[PDB]
Amino acid sequence: MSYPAFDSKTFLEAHIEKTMAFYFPTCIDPEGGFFQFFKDDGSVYDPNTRHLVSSTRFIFNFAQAYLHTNIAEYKHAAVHGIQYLRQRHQSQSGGYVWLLDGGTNLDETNHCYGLAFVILAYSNALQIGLSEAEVWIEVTYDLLETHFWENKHGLYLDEISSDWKTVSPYRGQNANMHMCEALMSAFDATQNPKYLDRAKLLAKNICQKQASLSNSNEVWEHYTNDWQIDWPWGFQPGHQTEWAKLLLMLDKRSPENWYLPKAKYLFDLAYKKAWDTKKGGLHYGYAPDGTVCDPDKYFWVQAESFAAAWLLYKATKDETYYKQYLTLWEFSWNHMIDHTFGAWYRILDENNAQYDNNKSPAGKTDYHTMGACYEVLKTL
């Protein structure tokens, strides 16, 4: 054995701990919230600009770490995060500031994607004991119901302007994926079956209905306001495998006989199309053609895929998925993970070369990789 035991509790916990150590305590802004732009070495390289997605995802980080390690200062960092979320990001209209610099808002557009992560963050707040979050979740859900929920399609639209008056013609799978995920987190935290029912409806609508609109029956990213397919461009493997994971997670909460075959199908297809057989890892995107059309290697794709693989292996006992889990971890250990400073590199080229030394710009808190580890951990 020349690799770590990627399927061991010890390894997964060790890796999470080293990733946590890259961000803590550097990301803490004594002024409020978190710094969101980190160099490979840990340096903050932009202390002012903040994005709702990192503001919420860091809440996920510290909350999950507290739930697993029971280290008190992690609960403190999560609460610090919640405070920043509610006092700085949560504006007037109930909507959340998308992007901001100091006391100035840069972008006040309402993104459904953002709202999903706001719900995710409130779930985590609740599970670490902020009793009030149950209400916050409940509030945010209705903001979405009122403004984003599109009952005749069973999906959420993507964005509305800050005034709440101009709706974007754009429809996208992404907001619905993360929305589904968030609502599962909400169901676990609250047991309110409303949320689980919405998660399963989103799952059905994206993975069955919207998927059927494609040749390969894979989930396409971009849709018209009809929710017809609008021809980044191409299929995104990471979202196929991410969906596989979500389906299996739903299949353990509220079973459905198409979940496992669909997860199985999406993963097999995505992995086979996107795995770089010479240098390793999954490419970022391929055409409906199946031609790889963006060969860069992203962290979240590797991570969501090894979570999906692990779940698939537990579900089927097919040793294929175990082996693929090991391949994804091997590639990751050898190329994505900074063994000096901790946490994952964001992106490599074709040849597994870094593009630069920006470990985590806004958006990346290593929510994806720690989350993937956490869910494999539940199965152990």
Side-chain angles (χ1 to χ4, degrees):
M1 205 52 183
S2 95
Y3 281 109
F6 296 113
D7 57 320
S8 64
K9 167 162 174 298
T10 294
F11 169 73
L12 290 166
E13 274 169 3
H15 170 77
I16 294 172
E17 161 182 70
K18 191 180 191 86
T19 291
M20 278 303 284
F22 169 83
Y23 289 106
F24 192 72
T26 314
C27 61
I28 302 297
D29 179 9
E31 298 288 86
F34 306 99
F35 301 108
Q36 295 178 359
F37 288 81
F38 304 92
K39 231 73 201 193
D40 288 337
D41 66 16
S43 295
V44 180
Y45 73 91
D46 180 340
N48 298 318
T49 302
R50 285 158 210 215
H51 194 294
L52 182 63
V53 175
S54 289
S55 282
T56 58
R57 280 184 189 192
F58 269 118
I59 285 169
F60 176 91
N61 281 22
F62 289 113
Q64 289 298 314
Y66 169 76
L67 285 174
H68 287 76
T69 66
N70 199 40
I71 293 169
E73 31 274 326
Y74 287 159
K75 195 199 166 184
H76 292 167
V79 155
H80 177 207
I82 298 290
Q83 285 170 11
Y84 190 77
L85 178 57
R86 308 209 68 217
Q87 309 175 357
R88 182 48 177 100
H89 274 284
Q90 196 191 3
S91 76
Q92 322 331 291
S93 320
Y96 290 75
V97 176
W98 184 247
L99 201 71
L100 60 83
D101 184 336
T104 302
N105 300 349
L106 297 176
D107 203 352
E108 304 187 61
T109 300
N110 291 290
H111 292 261
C112 180
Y113 188 96
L115 285 184
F117 270 109
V118 167
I119 284 175
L120 183 72
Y122 287 154
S123 299
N124 278 272
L126 182 68
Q127 340 202 72
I128 58 172
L130 272 63
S131 325
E132 198 47 56
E134 181 153 19
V135 170
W136 297 339
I137 294 171
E138 162 186 329
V139 174
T140 307
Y141 184 90
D142 312 302
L143 171 64
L144 266 159
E145 210 61 16
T146 296
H147 291 109
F148 292 84
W149 180 236
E150 273 190 305
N151 199 93
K152 139 195 182 213
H153 292 278
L155 291 169
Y156 292 94
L157 61 92
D158 181 31
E159 66 157 273
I160 313 153
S161 61
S162 44
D163 55 20
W164 291 120
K165 300 169 16 169
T166 303
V167 170
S168 197
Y170 182 79
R171 301 294 180 281
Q173 166 264 336
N174 242 345
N176 298 288
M177 190 183 60
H178 279 298
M179 194 62 210
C180 165
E181 166 201 23
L183 291 172
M184 285 176 64
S185 183
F187 172 70
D188 287 352
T190 65
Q191 289 298 314
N192 180 358
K194 178 188 235 166
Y195 299 141
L196 179 53
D197 289 343
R198 181 53 57 90
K200 308 183 39 157
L201 180 50
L202 294 174
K204 177 145 274 162
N205 278 319
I206 295 293
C207 290
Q208 279 192 323
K209 179 168 59 142
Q210 295 310 123
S212 296
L213 296 174
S214 96
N215 286 116
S216 49
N217 303 311
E218 299 172 276
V219 193
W220 185 259
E221 298 293 332
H222 313 279
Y223 305 87
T224 72
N225 52 326
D226 296 339
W227 279 105
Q228 287 300 107
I229 282 199
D230 192 344
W231 300 110
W233 186 89
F235 285 102
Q236 206 141 149
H239 288 155
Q240 313 312 316
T241 60
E242 170 139 54
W243 272 119
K245 172 176 56 94
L246 293 170
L247 298 184
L248 299 179
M249 286 179 64
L250 279 178
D251 198 12
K252 144 58 164 58
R253 311 190 189 292
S254 176
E256 225 84 58
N257 66 19
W258 66 271
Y259 280 172
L260 183 59
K262 188 62 166 171
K264 210 193 291 198
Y265 176 80
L266 290 174
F267 185 96
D268 292 340
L269 217 41
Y271 184 99
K272 174 163 30 178
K273 291 192 198 176
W275 181 261
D276 183 346
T277 47
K278 288 338 157 291
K279 298 181 150 310
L282 302 146
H283 296 141
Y284 190 55
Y286 50 77
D289 197 343
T291 301
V292 170
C293 55
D294 185 348
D296 284 334
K297 309 213 225 320
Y298 289 66
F299 74 108
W300 67 265
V301 170
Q302 269 41 255
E304 297 288 326
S305 293
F306 72 69
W310 187 255
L311 294 177
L312 275 176
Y313 168 64
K314 302 299 290 179
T316 63
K317 303 296 181 171
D318 183 349
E319 285 278 328
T320 296
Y321 297 119
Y322 178 76
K323 271 184 276 306
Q324 280 167 329
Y325 175 81
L326 291 183
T327 55
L328 289 160
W329 267 109
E330 282 165 11
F331 169 81
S332 294
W333 194 251
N334 294 330
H335 302 282
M336 301 303 284
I337 294 171
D338 185 336
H339 294 290
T340 297
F341 304 103
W344 285 51
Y345 296 136
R346 183 187 153 261
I347 178 186
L348 315 171
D349 65 9
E350 282 176 324
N351 323 290
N352 312 326
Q354 296 178 243
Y355 275 103
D356 62 27
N357 64 333
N358 289 341
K359 185 92 56 81
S360 304
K364 174 179 185 286
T365 75
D366 273 276
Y367 146 80
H368 273 301
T369 79
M370 285 185 285
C373 293
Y374 282 135
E375 198 111 0
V376 174
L377 262 175
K378 292 180 49 178
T379 71
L380 317 172

Short mmCIF file of all heavy atoms in Angstrom, two decimals, residues 230-267:
data_model
loop_
_atom_site.label_atom_id
_atom_site.label_comp_id
_atom_site.label_asym_id
_atom_site.label_seq_id
_atom_site.Cartn_x
_atom_site.Cartn_y
_atom_site.Cartn_z
N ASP A 230 -32.16 24.98 -24.36
CA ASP A 230 -31.39 25.98 -25.07
C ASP A 230 -30.05 25.38 -25.52
O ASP A 230 -29.16 25.18 -24.70
CB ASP A 230 -31.14 27.20 -24.17
CG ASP A 230 -30.58 28.39 -24.94
OD1 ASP A 230 -30.09 28.21 -26.08
OD2 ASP A 230 -30.63 29.52 -24.39
N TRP A 231 -29.93 25.09 -26.81
CA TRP A 231 -28.65 24.64 -27.35
C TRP A 231 -27.68 25.80 -27.54
O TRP A 231 -27.12 26.00 -28.62
CB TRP A 231 -28.85 23.90 -28.68
CG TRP A 231 -29.72 22.68 -28.55
CD1 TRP A 231 -30.98 22.52 -29.02
CD2 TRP A 231 -29.39 21.45 -27.88
NE1 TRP A 231 -31.46 21.27 -28.70
CE2 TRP A 231 -30.50 20.60 -28.00
CE3 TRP A 231 -28.26 21.00 -27.18
CZ2 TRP A 231 -30.52 19.31 -27.46
CZ3 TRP A 231 -28.28 19.71 -26.65
CH2 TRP A 231 -29.40 18.88 -26.79
N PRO A 232 -21.13 28.00 -19.37
CA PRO A 232 -20.34 27.06 -20.19
C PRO A 232 -21.25 26.16 -21.04
O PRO A 232 -22.39 25.92 -20.66
CB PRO A 232 -19.56 26.24 -19.15
CG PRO A 232 -19.52 27.10 -17.93
CD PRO A 232 -20.76 27.96 -17.94
N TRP A 233 -20.74 25.69 -22.18
CA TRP A 233 -21.56 24.89 -23.11
C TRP A 233 -21.22 23.40 -23.07
O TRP A 233 -20.06 23.03 -23.15
CB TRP A 233 -21.41 25.41 -24.54
CG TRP A 233 -22.33 24.73 -25.51
CD1 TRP A 233 -23.61 25.11 -25.83
CD2 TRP A 233 -22.05 23.56 -26.31
NE1 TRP A 233 -24.14 24.26 -26.77
CE2 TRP A 233 -23.21 23.30 -27.08
CE3 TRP A 233 -20.94 22.71 -26.44
CZ2 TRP A 233 -23.29 22.22 -27.96
CZ3 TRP A 233 -21.03 21.65 -27.31
CH2 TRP A 233 -22.19 21.41 -28.06
N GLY A 234 -22.24 22.55 -22.99
CA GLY A 234 -22.00 21.12 -23.03
C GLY A 234 -22.51 20.43 -21.78
O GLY A 234 -23.10 21.06 -20.92
N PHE A 235 -22.37 19.12 -21.72
CA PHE A 235 -22.74 18.44 -20.50
C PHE A 235 -21.58 18.56 -19.56
O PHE A 235 -20.41 18.38 -19.94
CB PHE A 235 -23.11 16.99 -20.74
CG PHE A 235 -24.44 16.82 -21.37
CD1 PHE A 235 -24.54 16.54 -22.73
CD2 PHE A 235 -25.60 16.97 -20.63
CE1 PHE A 235 -25.78 16.38 -23.33
CE2 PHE A 235 -26.83 16.82 -21.21
CZ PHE A 235 -26.92 16.53 -22.57
N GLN A 236 -21.96 18.81 -18.31
CA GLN A 236 -21.07 18.92 -17.16
C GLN A 236 -21.13 17.64 -16.31
O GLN A 236 -22.04 17.47 -15.52
CB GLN A 236 -21.52 20.15 -16.35
CG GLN A 236 -20.54 20.87 -15.48
CD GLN A 236 -20.76 22.36 -15.55
OE1 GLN A 236 -20.53 23.09 -14.58
NE2 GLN A 236 -21.04 22.85 -16.77
N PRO A 237 -20.11 16.77 -16.43
CA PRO A 237 -19.98 15.49 -15.71
C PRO A 237 -20.20 15.62 -14.22
O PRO A 237 -20.83 14.76 -13.59
CB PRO A 237 -18.52 15.06 -15.95
CG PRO A 237 -17.99 15.94 -16.98
CD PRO A 237 -18.89 17.12 -17.17
N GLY A 238 -19.67 16.71 -13.66
CA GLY A 238 -19.79 16.95 -12.23
C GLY A 238 -21.22 17.06 -11.76
O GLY A 238 -21.55 16.64 -10.65
N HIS A 239 -22.09 17.60 -12.61
CA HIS A 239 -23.50 17.71 -12.24
C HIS A 239 -24.25 16.39 -12.47
O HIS A 239 -25.21 16.10 -11.76
CB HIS A 239 -24.16 18.84 -13.02
CG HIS A 239 -23.73 20.20 -12.56
ND1 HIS A 239 -23.77 21.31 -13.37
CD2 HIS A 239 -23.22 20.61 -11.37
CE1 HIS A 239 -23.32 22.36 -12.69
NE2 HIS A 239 -22.98 21.95 -11.48
N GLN A 240 -23.77 15.58 -13.39
CA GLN A 240 -24.34 14.25 -13.57
C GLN A 240 -24.08 13.44 -12.30
O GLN A 240 -25.00 12.85 -11.72
CB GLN A 240 -23.73 13.54 -14.79
CG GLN A 240 -23.65 14.38 -16.07
CD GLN A 240 -24.96 15.09 -16.38
OE1 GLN A 240 -26.04 14.51 -16.28
NE2 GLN A 240 -24.86 16.37 -16.74
N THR A 241 -22.82 13.44 -11.85
CA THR A 241 -22.44 12.61 -10.71
C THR A 241 -22.98 13.20 -9.42
O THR A 241 -23.36 12.47 -8.49
CB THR A 241 -20.90 12.44 -10.61
OG1 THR A 241 -20.27 13.72 -10.46
CG2 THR A 241 -20.36 11.75 -11.87
N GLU A 242 -23.08 14.53 -9.39
CA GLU A 242 -23.64 15.21 -8.23
C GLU A 242 -25.10 14.79 -8.10
O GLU A 242 -25.56 14.39 -7.03
CB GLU A 242 -23.52 16.72 -8.38
CG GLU A 242 -24.26 17.55 -7.36
CD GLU A 242 -23.46 18.74 -6.88
OE1 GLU A 242 -23.00 19.53 -7.74
OE2 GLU A 242 -23.33 18.90 -5.65
N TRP A 243 -25.80 14.79 -9.23
CA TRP A 243 -27.17 14.29 -9.23
C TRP A 243 -27.29 12.82 -8.82
O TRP A 243 -28.17 12.48 -8.04
CB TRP A 243 -27.80 14.46 -10.60
CG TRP A 243 -28.46 15.78 -10.79
CD1 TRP A 243 -28.14 16.73 -11.71
CD2 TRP A 243 -29.56 16.29 -10.04
NE1 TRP A 243 -28.99 17.80 -11.58
CE2 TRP A 243 -29.87 17.56 -10.56
CE3 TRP A 243 -30.33 15.80 -8.98
CZ2 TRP A 243 -30.91 18.35 -10.06
CZ3 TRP A 243 -31.38 16.57 -8.49
CH2 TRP A 243 -31.65 17.84 -9.02
N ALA A 244 -26.42 11.95 -9.32
CA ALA A 244 -26.39 10.57 -8.84
C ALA A 244 -26.37 10.54 -7.31
O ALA A 244 -27.14 9.81 -6.66
CB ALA A 244 -25.18 9.84 -9.40
N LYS A 245 -25.50 11.35 -6.73
CA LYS A 245 -25.40 11.41 -5.28
C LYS A 245 -26.72 11.85 -4.64
O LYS A 245 -27.19 11.23 -3.68
CB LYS A 245 -24.29 12.37 -4.84
CG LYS A 245 -24.29 12.62 -3.33
CD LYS A 245 -23.13 13.48 -2.92
CE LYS A 245 -23.15 14.77 -3.71
NZ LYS A 245 -23.84 15.89 -3.03
N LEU A 246 -27.29 12.94 -5.15
CA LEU A 246 -28.55 13.43 -4.61
C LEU A 246 -29.65 12.35 -4.70
O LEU A 246 -30.37 12.12 -3.73
CB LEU A 246 -28.96 14.72 -5.33
CG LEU A 246 -27.98 15.87 -5.00
CD1 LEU A 246 -28.20 17.10 -5.87
CD2 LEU A 246 -28.03 16.27 -3.52
N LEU A 247 -29.76 11.66 -5.83
CA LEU A 247 -30.73 10.58 -5.98
C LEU A 247 -30.54 9.49 -4.94
O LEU A 247 -31.51 8.99 -4.40
CB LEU A 247 -30.65 9.95 -7.36
CG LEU A 247 -30.96 10.92 -8.50
CD1 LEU A 247 -30.96 10.21 -9.87
CD2 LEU A 247 -32.23 11.73 -8.25
N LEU A 248 -29.30 9.11 -4.65
CA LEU A 248 -29.10 8.02 -3.70
C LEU A 248 -29.42 8.51 -2.28
O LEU A 248 -29.99 7.78 -1.45
CB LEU A 248 -27.68 7.46 -3.82
CG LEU A 248 -27.44 6.90 -5.23
CD1 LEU A 248 -26.06 6.35 -5.43
CD2 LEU A 248 -28.46 5.84 -5.57
N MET A 249 -29.09 9.76 -2.02
CA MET A 249 -29.41 10.37 -0.74
C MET A 249 -30.95 10.44 -0.53
O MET A 249 -31.45 10.19 0.56
CB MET A 249 -28.77 11.74 -0.67
CG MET A 249 -27.27 11.72 -0.47
SD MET A 249 -26.61 13.41 -0.42
CE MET A 249 -27.40 14.07 1.05
N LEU A 250 -31.69 10.75 -1.59
CA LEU A 250 -33.14 10.76 -1.54
C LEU A 250 -33.67 9.34 -1.42
O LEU A 250 -34.66 9.09 -0.75
CB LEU A 250 -33.69 11.41 -2.80
CG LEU A 250 -33.70 12.93 -2.76
CD1 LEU A 250 -34.22 13.44 -4.08
CD2 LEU A 250 -34.52 13.45 -1.59
N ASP A 251 -32.99 8.40 -2.05
CA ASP A 251 -33.42 7.01 -2.04
C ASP A 251 -33.28 6.42 -0.65
O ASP A 251 -33.91 5.40 -0.35
CB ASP A 251 -32.64 6.18 -3.06
CG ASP A 251 -33.33 4.87 -3.38
OD1 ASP A 251 -34.50 4.71 -2.99
OD2 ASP A 251 -32.72 4.03 -4.07
N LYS A 252 -32.45 7.01 0.21
CA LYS A 252 -32.41 6.46 1.56
C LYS A 252 -33.43 7.16 2.44
O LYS A 252 -33.94 6.57 3.39
CB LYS A 252 -31.01 6.61 2.17
CG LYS A 252 -30.92 6.92 3.71
CD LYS A 252 -31.56 5.95 4.72
CE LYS A 252 -31.02 6.20 6.13
NZ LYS A 252 -31.28 7.64 6.60
N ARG A 253 -33.84 8.37 2.08
CA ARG A 253 -34.82 9.06 2.90
C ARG A 253 -36.24 8.69 2.54
O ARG A 253 -37.04 8.33 3.40
CB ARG A 253 -34.62 10.57 2.79
CG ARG A 253 -33.19 10.95 2.99
CD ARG A 253 -32.96 12.45 3.13
NE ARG A 253 -31.53 12.74 3.10
CZ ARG A 253 -30.67 12.39 4.05
NH1 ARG A 253 -31.07 11.73 5.12
NH2 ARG A 253 -29.38 12.71 3.92
N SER A 254 -36.55 8.74 1.25
CA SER A 254 -37.89 8.46 0.79
C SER A 254 -37.78 7.74 -0.55
O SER A 254 -37.79 8.37 -1.61
CB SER A 254 -38.68 9.77 0.69
OG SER A 254 -39.98 9.61 0.15
N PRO A 255 -37.63 6.40 -0.50
CA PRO A 255 -37.28 5.54 -1.65
C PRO A 255 -38.20 5.65 -2.87
O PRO A 255 -39.36 5.99 -2.75
CB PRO A 255 -37.35 4.12 -1.08
CG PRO A 255 -37.34 4.26 0.40
CD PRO A 255 -37.78 5.64 0.76
N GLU A 256 -37.64 5.34 -4.03
CA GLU A 256 -38.31 5.45 -5.32
C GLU A 256 -37.57 4.55 -6.30
O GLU A 256 -36.34 4.63 -6.41
CB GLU A 256 -38.31 6.89 -5.82
CG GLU A 256 -39.64 7.36 -6.38
CD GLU A 256 -40.58 7.85 -5.29
OE1 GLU A 256 -40.21 8.79 -4.55
OE2 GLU A 256 -41.69 7.30 -5.16
N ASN A 257 -38.29 3.70 -7.03
CA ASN A 257 -37.63 2.61 -7.73
C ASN A 257 -36.80 3.03 -8.96
O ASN A 257 -36.06 2.21 -9.51
CB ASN A 257 -38.63 1.49 -8.11
CG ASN A 257 -39.68 1.92 -9.13
OD1 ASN A 257 -39.51 2.91 -9.85
ND2 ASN A 257 -40.75 1.13 -9.24
N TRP A 258 -36.91 4.28 -9.40
CA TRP A 258 -36.07 4.76 -10.51
C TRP A 258 -34.77 5.45 -10.03
O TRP A 258 -33.85 5.68 -10.83
CB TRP A 258 -36.85 5.73 -11.41
CG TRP A 258 -37.24 7.03 -10.73
CD1 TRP A 258 -38.38 7.26 -10.04
CD2 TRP A 258 -36.51 8.27 -10.73
NE1 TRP A 258 -38.41 8.56 -9.58
CE2 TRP A 258 -37.27 9.20 -9.99
CE3 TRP A 258 -35.28 8.68 -11.25
CZ2 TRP A 258 -36.85 10.52 -9.78
CZ3 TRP A 258 -34.86 9.99 -11.03
CH2 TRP A 258 -35.65 10.89 -10.31
N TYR A 259 -34.68 5.75 -8.74
CA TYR A 259 -33.53 6.47 -8.19
C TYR A 259 -32.20 5.79 -8.51
O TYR A 259 -31.32 6.38 -9.15
CB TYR A 259 -33.66 6.62 -6.68
CG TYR A 259 -34.58 7.74 -6.27
CD1 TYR A 259 -34.94 7.91 -4.93
CD2 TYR A 259 -35.09 8.63 -7.20
CE1 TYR A 259 -35.77 8.93 -4.54
CE2 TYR A 259 -35.93 9.66 -6.81
CZ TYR A 259 -36.27 9.80 -5.48
OH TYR A 259 -37.11 10.83 -5.11
N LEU A 260 -32.06 4.53 -8.08
CA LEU A 260 -30.81 3.82 -8.24
C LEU A 260 -30.45 3.55 -9.71
O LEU A 260 -29.30 3.76 -10.08
CB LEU A 260 -30.83 2.51 -7.46
CG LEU A 260 -29.52 1.73 -7.51
CD1 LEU A 260 -28.41 2.60 -6.95
CD2 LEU A 260 -29.64 0.46 -6.70
N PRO A 261 -31.40 3.07 -10.54
CA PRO A 261 -31.00 2.93 -11.94
C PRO A 261 -30.60 4.26 -12.60
O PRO A 261 -29.71 4.27 -13.47
CB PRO A 261 -32.24 2.35 -12.62
CG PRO A 261 -32.93 1.63 -11.54
CD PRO A 261 -32.69 2.40 -10.28
N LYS A 262 -31.25 5.36 -12.24
CA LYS A 262 -30.90 6.64 -12.85
C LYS A 262 -29.52 7.11 -12.37
O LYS A 262 -28.68 7.53 -13.18
CB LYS A 262 -31.98 7.68 -12.59
CG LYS A 262 -31.77 8.98 -13.36
CD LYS A 262 -31.81 8.76 -14.88
CE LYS A 262 -31.94 10.08 -15.65
NZ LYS A 262 -31.79 10.01 -17.14
N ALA A 263 -29.28 7.04 -11.05
CA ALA A 263 -27.96 7.34 -10.49
C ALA A 263 -26.88 6.51 -11.19
O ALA A 263 -25.80 7.01 -11.58
CB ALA A 263 -27.94 7.09 -8.97
N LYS A 264 -27.18 5.22 -11.34
CA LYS A 264 -26.27 4.28 -11.93
C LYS A 264 -25.98 4.72 -13.37
O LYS A 264 -24.82 4.79 -13.81
CB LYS A 264 -26.88 2.88 -11.86
CG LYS A 264 -25.86 1.80 -11.77
CD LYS A 264 -26.36 0.37 -12.00
CE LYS A 264 -27.26 -0.18 -10.91
NZ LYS A 264 -27.29 -1.69 -11.06
N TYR A 265 -27.03 5.12 -14.07
CA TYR A 265 -26.92 5.48 -15.49
C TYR A 265 -26.09 6.76 -15.71
O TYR A 265 -25.11 6.75 -16.48
CB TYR A 265 -28.32 5.66 -16.08
CG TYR A 265 -28.33 6.13 -17.52
CD1 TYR A 265 -28.11 5.23 -18.55
CD2 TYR A 265 -28.59 7.46 -17.84
CE1 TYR A 265 -28.13 5.64 -19.87
CE2 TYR A 265 -28.61 7.89 -19.17
CZ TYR A 265 -28.38 6.96 -20.18
OH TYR A 265 -28.38 7.32 -21.51
N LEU A 266 -26.47 7.83 -15.01
CA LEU A 266 -25.78 9.12 -15.05
C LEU A 266 -24.32 8.96 -14.68
O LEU A 266 -23.45 9.46 -15.39
CB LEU A 266 -26.44 10.14 -14.13
CG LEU A 266 -27.81 10.62 -14.60
CD1 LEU A 266 -28.45 11.51 -13.55
CD2 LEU A 266 -27.66 11.36 -15.92
N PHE A 267 -24.04 8.26 -13.59
CA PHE A 267 -22.64 8.12 -13.21
C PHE A 267 -21.85 7.35 -14.27
O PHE A 267 -20.79 7.81 -14.68
CB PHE A 267 -22.50 7.42 -11.87
CG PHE A 267 -21.08 7.36 -11.38
CD1 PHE A 267 -20.60 8.32 -10.49
CD2 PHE A 267 -20.22 6.35 -11.80
CE1 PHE A 267 -19.28 8.27 -10.04
CE2 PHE A 267 -18.91 6.30 -11.37
CZ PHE A 267 -18.44 7.26 -10.48
#
